[PDB]
């Protein structure tokens, strides 16, 4: 019994991570989050969890 | 998993088994029990035995 | 003000799941075979439209 | 009598099942189990609506 991407997963499969790319449009694959976007530092903050 | 081959049943309700590999799980938890063969049914949401 | 409000209406609604296990697209197709996969994404595609 | 055909109209249509088991709600969570009941009830709910 699991639940699905909604808190920081310390179980993962065997994907190799690869390394990350700002400025670009780009497909991402981030914690088994899929999407395809511009990635960029973000001035804003976060919680812990 | 799979490659033991006893004949076993998968059956992933909210996932499918070739995808669990690719998702990143949190909270996992593994519960074993034993029970009668005919009983199995009964170990699925919303089932009444 | 009838047609900002009409336009975050539909902004809205792109969170509904209409009867899917999620909103997000891409969290189905990770999760699922394409013949699960196919019946959520219809009723997604079904309600947007 | 067009505002009168309409709203008989409106009461009518709750008896339509819609492609659900039943127009009964209350039917369709007593026979089914529940993940297929959760369907036949998003039938129900996407016709009413």
Redesign the interface.
């Known amino acids: 019994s699991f639940e699905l991407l909604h808190a920081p997963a310390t179980v993962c499969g065997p994907k190799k991570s690869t390394n990350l790319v700002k400025n670009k449009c780009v497909n991402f694959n981030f914690n088994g989050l899929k999407g395809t976007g511009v990635l960029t530092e973000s001035n804003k903050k976060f919680l812990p969890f | 998993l799979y490659n033991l081959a006893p004949f076993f049943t998968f059956k992933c309700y909210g996932v499918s088994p070739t995808k669990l590999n690719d998702l990143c799980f949190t909270n996992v938890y593994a519960d074993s029990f034993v029970i009668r063969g005919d009983e199995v049914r009964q170990i699925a949401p919303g089932q009444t035995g | 003000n009838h047609n900002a409000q009409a336009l975050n209406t539909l902004v809205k609604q792109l969170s509904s799941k ?2 899917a ?1 999620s909103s997000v697209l ?2 189905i ?5 394409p013949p ?1 996969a196919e019946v959520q994404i219809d ?1 997604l595609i079904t ?1 947007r439209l």
């Open positions: 209409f009867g296990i891409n969290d197709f990770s999760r699922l075979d699960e009723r309600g």
